[PDB]
Structures are given as structure tokens and as C-alpha cells.
Amino acid sequence: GLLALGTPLQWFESRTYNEHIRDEGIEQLLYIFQAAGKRDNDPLFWGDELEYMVVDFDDKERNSMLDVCHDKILTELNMEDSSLCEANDVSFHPEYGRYMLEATPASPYLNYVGSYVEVNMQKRRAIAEYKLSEYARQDSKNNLHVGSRSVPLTLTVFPRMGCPDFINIKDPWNHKNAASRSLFLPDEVINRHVRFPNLTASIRTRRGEKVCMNVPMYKDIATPETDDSIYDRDWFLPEDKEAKLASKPGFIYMDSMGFGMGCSCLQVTFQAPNINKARYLYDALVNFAPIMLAFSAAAPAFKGWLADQDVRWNVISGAVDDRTPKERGVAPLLPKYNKNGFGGIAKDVQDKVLEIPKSRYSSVDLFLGGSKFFNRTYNDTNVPINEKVLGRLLENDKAPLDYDLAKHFAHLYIRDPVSTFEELLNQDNKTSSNHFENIQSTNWQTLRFKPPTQQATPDKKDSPGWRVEFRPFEVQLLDFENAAYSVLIYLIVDSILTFSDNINAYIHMSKVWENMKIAHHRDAILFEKFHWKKSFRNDTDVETEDYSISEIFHNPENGIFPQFVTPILCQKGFVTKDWKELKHSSKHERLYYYLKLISDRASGELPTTAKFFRNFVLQHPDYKHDSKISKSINYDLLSTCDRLTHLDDSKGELTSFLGAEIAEYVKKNKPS
Numbered sequence: 001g002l003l004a005l006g007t008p009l010q011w012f013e014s015r016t017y018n019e020h021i022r023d024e025g026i027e028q029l030l031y032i033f034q035a036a037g038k039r040d041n042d043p044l045f046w047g048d049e050l051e052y053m054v055v056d057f058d059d060k061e062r063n064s065m066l067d068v069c070h071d072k073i074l075t076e077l078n079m080e081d082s083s084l085c086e087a088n089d090v091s092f093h094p095e096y097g098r099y100m101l102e103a104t105p106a107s108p109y110l111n112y113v114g115s116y117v118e119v120n121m122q123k124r125r126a127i128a129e130y131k132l133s134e135y136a137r138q139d140s141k142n143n144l145h146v147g148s149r150s151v152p153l154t155l156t157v158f159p160r161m162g163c164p165d166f167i168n169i170k171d172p173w174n175h176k177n178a179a180s181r182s183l184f185l186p187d188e189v190i191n192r193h194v195r196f197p198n199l200t201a202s203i204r205t206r207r208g209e210k211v212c213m214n215v216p217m218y219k220d221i222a223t224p225e226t227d228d229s230i231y232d233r234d235w236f237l238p239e240d241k242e243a244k245l246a247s248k249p250g251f252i253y254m255d256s257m258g259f260g261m262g263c264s265c266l267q268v269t270f271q272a273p274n275i276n277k278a279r280y281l282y283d284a285l286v287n288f289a290p291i292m293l294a295f296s297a298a299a300p301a302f303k304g305w306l307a308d309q310d311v312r313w314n315v316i317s318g319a320v321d322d323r324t325p326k327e328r329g330v331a332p333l334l335p336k337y338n339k340n341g342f343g344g345i346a347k348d349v350q351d352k353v354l355e356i357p358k359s360r361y362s363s364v365d366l367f368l369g370g371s372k373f374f375n376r377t378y379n380d381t382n383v384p385i386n387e388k389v390l391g392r393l394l395e396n397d398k399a400p401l402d403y404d405l406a407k408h409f410a411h412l413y414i415r416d417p418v419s420t421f422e423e424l425l426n427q428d429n430k431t432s433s434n435h436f437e438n439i440q441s442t443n444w445q446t447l448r449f450k451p452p453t454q455q456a457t458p459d460k461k462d463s464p465g466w467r468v469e470f471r472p473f474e475v476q477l478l479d480f481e482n483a484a485y486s487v488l489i490y491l492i493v494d495s496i497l498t499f500s501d502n503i504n505a506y507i508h509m510s511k512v513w514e515n516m517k518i519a520h521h522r523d524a525i526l527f528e529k530f531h532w533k534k535s536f537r538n539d540t541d542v543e544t545e546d547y548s549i550s551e552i553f554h555n556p557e558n559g560i561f562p563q564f565v566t567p568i569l570c571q572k573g574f575v576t577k578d579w580k581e582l583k584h585s586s587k588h589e590r591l592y593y594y595l596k597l598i599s600d601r602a603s604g605e606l607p608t609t610a611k612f613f614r615n616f617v618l619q620h621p622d623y624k625h626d627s628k629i630s631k632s633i634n635y636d637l638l639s640t641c642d643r644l645t646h647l648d649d650s651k652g653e654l655t656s657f658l659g660a661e662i663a664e665y666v667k668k669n670k671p672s
Ligand SMILES: N[C@@H](CCC(=O)N[C@@H](CS)C(=O)NCC(=O)O)C(=O)O
Pocket: 051, 095, 096, 199, 260, 261, 262, 263, 264, 265, 312, 316, 441, 442, 444
């Protein structure tokens, strides 16, 4: 569906409600516990979300741009084409990008659904393409977008974001971009739902400096010493003068929310049998996140530069980092504007400000605990909390919480609201969870623990229960890939839920955070090592050693395959002892190829999308050995991507990306 309409409050106007919003949200959370805390036997309903970028291929000029003009597609698919969607069990939603689409199945899958995930993804893609060709026909007859061809591509990152000629709008700088005030992204990159410009404005104002994300540059033989795309400008104060102080030699400089939230990923949500199992699951997935981040890398470039990392994560992390310099333990870049480092924080609350170590978009901070292997000492990192929120979740007449669970909520609640409508200031806290969602939904982490609504009382069997979202996977080009990774997480989750008495996955959170930095490094999948529990079938044992991705997927003692995937496939009867027996299964041949794709990438036999893009740029005739992605490199790159997305081996590129065996396999067999 669409986000329903409202008037956003600008930050200066909204900040005087921070405490009102937090208070009432907590009350709502208490009502939700009171009402749904006792749900049980909830079934394993689950679903993926994909995010797409509509690219306008201008073949005559050899230029691929983001198409910021067919954005009505999201309204049409939710009005007069909504019946197309439902008949097809798909659903479409807006995302940050004006050029982005988000789409999910219309109903959750129930337990194992084989190839249906891929089938449902393809339908999402076909309905998008269909709508695009309808616009192409209308456009033609009104002489609009001549020589343009729009295609939706599931790219993690647009390699030419905020570079010249990257959006299909003539002369986008002939007016100002008051929302982001970016040097590089005109505000037309932003979806027109008021929420998105608003979040963009509030975070910038609250911070009192532009968001800033410095990404190490790939260091090739002729690479400039600095990011020579930086220029000086005079539209905005303090912002146009920040760049020279915020940038750093040998780093791509990014300065706007759309560089981050203008990226795409694959997200998967699961419903646990009840809250306790949801905690158990969420805790167990914590260290899988850095690992699947590295394993799925798809983002080797930003703002036109080959980067020295392969994932989006830290970029999205900085793109919505509302921490004032005081909050980050640092001097403002421009002290006469950012007054004492408190940016836009109210004068009457500066005394209560905290040094906070991590962006509101960052890895899980705390295990929730509550299961037999948990021990509070595994939460061994710096996690500031809202003491007031802790107190009240601890001591209240609706649903008093255990201290570990109270601490998680208390940590999420150290942030202010960054987007609030005036209509909605006063809600009925027994029926509404909108204020809790304000803060829940703007703490973006590697997982999300999702309480349900106050309507989900245990007798409502069909309501959503307690859920866990697995958020780190970079999105891939092919529906085949994205289905594989969706099923991978599915099997891992099912393994975790079926074997809960036996699987102890606890490790010290600090190792996980370290894992999150390693997962960024260029070619991490191919040689880096990550702290990984040495055994799972083992009460009290929280020892790790350092293992490559290959070992992490394949070690008998503690690998993803022999300890998660294979065991659940045995017990469901898909195989008698090994995941590879599936090559010969009648019912399950496709599951073998998903797993083989996963196994082969985890061991370096086949390349990540990030790798394949890095190679392509490096081996391009026009590449100038300087790390720059030209209009023309970007065009062929995305043309390749387009063919790949479509299983088109006419140039041997699918065979080069997937290898012969999988390439033939997917060309010769549609999902059913
Ligand atoms: N594109 C993001 C995931 C999607 C996301 O976090 N979207 C933001 C956009 S502001 C959001 O909060 N979406 C839900 C909403 O806007 O209500 C990623 O790769 O992590």
C-alpha cells in the first residue's frame, strides 16, 4: 500500500515533542505486551522484501541514468492496478528513492515453499516491466522521453549516484535542493511522499551539519590524491562550506541521505512461535549478520569511484547519522554555525545529551536474552540507555519486563523522533502503536525485533505475532540469486527454531562488531577471517576462533551447511545425509542449485556481484586506471546487468558470472 497522507513537522517545530512521543510510545509498547505477550503456537509465516532501481537506458548517448520520472507507478499499482497485484500475490511500496520500488509477496509464505519465492519475485519484476512498457507506449505518443528505455534492476548501489547526467531530468541544478542541500544529489532523487524530504531535512538540521560518509578509494596507479569531484558553492550556509573540512584524502566523499537510503537490499521477516522463541531466534542471528553481509557483497563503487570495500552498510549507516558533534565526541566543523556542537538539539535539553558511539543505523547493540544459554556478560560493549525508559519498562502496571528486554528498548530510545505528523500527536495508546513505530522504525539495525499490534491478542490466530527481520543482505541482480539467499536464511531460521534446545550461538557482542568492520573489506569473502563460535552444540561454551567464509560455510564442526542447512534438510526428509543428494532429487532439484550457488560463492569458486562489477570496471577498454567510473563504463556495466537479469547469454556474461553449470541450469529451467 501507499503511506497515508499528512503534514510533517520541521525539526525546529518537532523537537519540543520528543519527550511526549517517547513517553506515549512506551505506553503503547506496554499495551502491546499486555495484549500479545502470551501468543503461542504462532506458525512460521515469513516473507522477503526486494528493492529496485528504475534505470533509464539512453542507448543513443550511451548514458544509464536513474529514472526519476515514472514514479507514479507506485500510486497506480495501489489504485487502479491493485487488482493486477492481488490476483498475482504481490504488493508494492515506496522507498526513499524517487527511482526506487519496493515489492513483497501479498501474503507471507508458510514454512518451506520451494521455488515459489522465485516465482513471486519474478511476478513482482514482470508487473514493474509491464507498467514500464505501458508508460513507454504513452510516452511515445506524447513525444516524451525519446530514445529512452526504462528497466528495473535490483542493484545495491547506483555506481553513478550524484555524478553528472545521472538522473533523466534536463538541467536539475537550475533550482536549489533545499532538503538535502547536497553538492551532488538534487532533491529529485527523493520520493515525493512527505516523509522522505522530511527525514532528510530533520536529520540535517538536528545534526547541524550535512551527513558525511567517507569511503576509502580503490588505490589504482593514476588515482587522484583526493576526491576531485568536490567543488566549492554558495547556495547554502553552513553546508556548502562543510565539504572542504569534512572530506579526506584517498576517500570518496558523500554528503546526502540518498547516497545511503538510495541504496537497495534484500530483507527477510520470520514469525516465531512466540516472544521467547523470537528472542531466542534474534539473539542466534546476530553473528550471521556480519557474515551474510560479507558473503553477499554487491557494492564495490560509490559516486563514480571504485571503492576500497564491497558493501553498502557503512554508507547507509552514515547517511542517516543524526549524531551532533557533541554526541560524537568531536568539534563541529563550523563552530559559528554548529553552536558548541549541539546542532539543532533544544537549549533546554543539552544538559541531558549523551556521547553515543554508533549511528541510529548500525549493528544490533544488545542480545535480548531470556533463553537458557544467555548470560548478560555477552553484552560487553558500550551501549548508552534511556534510564527513564528502563525504569518504566521495569516498573509499571501493564507489563513489567525483564531487565535484558527492558535494556534493548531503553537503548533504542536514546534517539529523538525524526519525522512526525501534526495530525498524529495525540493517539489512543490502547489501539495505536504509531508513536512506538516512530522510534522502532528509525532504529535501523542488522536485525529488527518486531512486536506486533495491540490487536494481536492470542485468540486472533491470523494476526502477525512476534517477528524477527534479518536485514543485512545486499540485493542481487537475478531473482534466482535473491531466492537462493532468501531460502538460505529460511533454512537457517528453521534449523534454529527446530533445534532450540541444542543450539547455543552466543558470542561476545564486541566480536560481532569487529566482524561488521571486517565484512566491509574488498574481497573479504575470498580471504578475511571472522570470529565465529567454535561449536554450537555445547552449553556454556562461548569460545570463538577465526574462520574464513569458506570454513564458516563448510566446517563439519561449526559450519552453516553441516550444522544448520544439512541437519534441517535431513529432518524434513529432503535428504538422508547430505545437502548434495538434492542434485538428484525430483521434487527439489532447484534447491540444489540455490545451495550450490551459495556454496560456490562462499568458497571463491564463483564471484560476488561486487567482485564481478569490480572486474568489469577494471577490464573495461575505456577504464583510465584512475578508479573513475565514466558515463560510458557505467552504461555498459548496467547493460551487462540488464542482460544478466534477463538470463541472456548472447555475450557469454551469464556463463562468466554464474559458471557454465548454473548458467545452463537456470536458462534451461524456470521455477515451478
Ligand atoms: N534501503 C535500506 C533498507 C530500507 C530502509 O531502511 N528504508 C528506510 C527509508 S527512510 C525506511 O525506514 N523505510 C521504512 C519507512 O520509510 O517507513 C537498506 O539497504 O538497508
